[model samples]
Target: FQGAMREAIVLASGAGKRLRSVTGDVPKVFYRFDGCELVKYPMISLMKNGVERFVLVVSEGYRDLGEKVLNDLGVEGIVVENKKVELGNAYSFFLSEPYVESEKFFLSCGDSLFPPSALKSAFSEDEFHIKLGVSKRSDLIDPEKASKVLVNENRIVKIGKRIDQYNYFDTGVFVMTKKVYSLKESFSWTEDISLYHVLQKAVDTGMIVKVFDFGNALWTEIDSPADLNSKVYELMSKIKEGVAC
Candidate 1:
């Protein structure tokens, strides 16, 4: 992220409905993740990486709770916003419009956790949209439970519901410029498909897009009890090992 790209919009609004009882009445974004509230690690990680503006997108019911947690953590620069219950990753980016202008921005799911330093690596200035950090093809995935991406060289050729079509797992993080937003707006944000499809549209339409392969990089999204436990343990290990945020 550069210039006004300093703002990292964290999408924390999902219900995690498929997660069953774990979601409770509050949004799943509030669940315990990475040794803290599910969204904490992503926020803190972004801060340590020099991101100044954070637009925490949350569900309507948990707006108060999200703010309380932000206050408790002494995170003053953060701003929490609400999104429609059905919003997807693409819509989350769409909702962040009021906070960010014509510039690049960092986008990630609030419950998505990953090694913060994975972001410190180099990025392509020639790229318009950077797709999620993907995982290696054979790293063990349940097609019923994974989103995939297809890449050619350094650019992503396609992304969407049938991600297994490309055989790469999405890590839920991206750096996209305003040009992508322009495309999403044109579509009316319809096309009841995954955000990958939205990005894929950008690619298919001739927009310059890039895919930064953080495949097998330390990353996992919290959607079940197992992911929650693992993320917490992974976070503790990082802290104990003296790893920087």
Candidate 2:
């Protein structure tokens, strides 16, 4: 089945400081898990579900590697470099705006992986202006670092790393429209901006950001070797068995 949107923008500009110990000079997006690069997982899943174009935002240093990865995968995409890697992920995301041609598109992290089924479910929904992929299960990611979300009915009321009360874990996946770019004005004075800040601003501005809960579906953001080991085997097995897609 074809995806609801034809384009996707992936944020891969992070330095992956936390996983530096294991990855050394290599970026985490280039790190391999079960023979696949971390970044490829999301792109492959999106491609299988009919996303026709991709805009990959990567650190300036890794521009060649990013382009090579996409070429090897034979994906129709362009790799945009972020010179100021320290400016944070939201800036990296913004860099892809010019390359995004769809009114609505998928947004995902380079190091995160989710089942194709979950993406299909998110793509099937046609009503939301902004939809966040979330999970009620906290076991998939590190609770302390994961962006938490507080929902009132289907809408996300708050989203951040330090929110005290929250029921959902941000899956690092999103379905967003171009309207999300309008919220950038709020970050005029903000030096470092994350997607969390953007979404929080969306919430504060009274935008209805809905949630696509991936109930019982396996998903992960690979931040470290531990995270890779914890879920890789199961996820790989599912993919190989034709159950994950």
Clashes of each: 1, 0
Please give, for residues 1-245, the per-residue lDDT of candidate 2 as tens digits.
43467788988888888899888998988877676677888887777677878999988878898888888777788999999887788888878888888888999988777767767558554566689988886566767667999988778989999898898988889999998877766776447888888888888888878988888788878886678664666775554344222
Best candidate per lDDT, number? Answer: 2
> Residue by residue across 148-183, what tens digits does model 1's lDDT show?
777777677777655545856666777867677676
RMSD of model 2 against the true structure:
2.6
TM per candidate comes to 0.82, 0.92
Give each model's whole-structure lDDT: 0.64, 0.80
User: lDDT score of model 2?
Assistant: 0.80
Displacement of the residue 215 alpha carbon in candidate 2, Å: 1.3
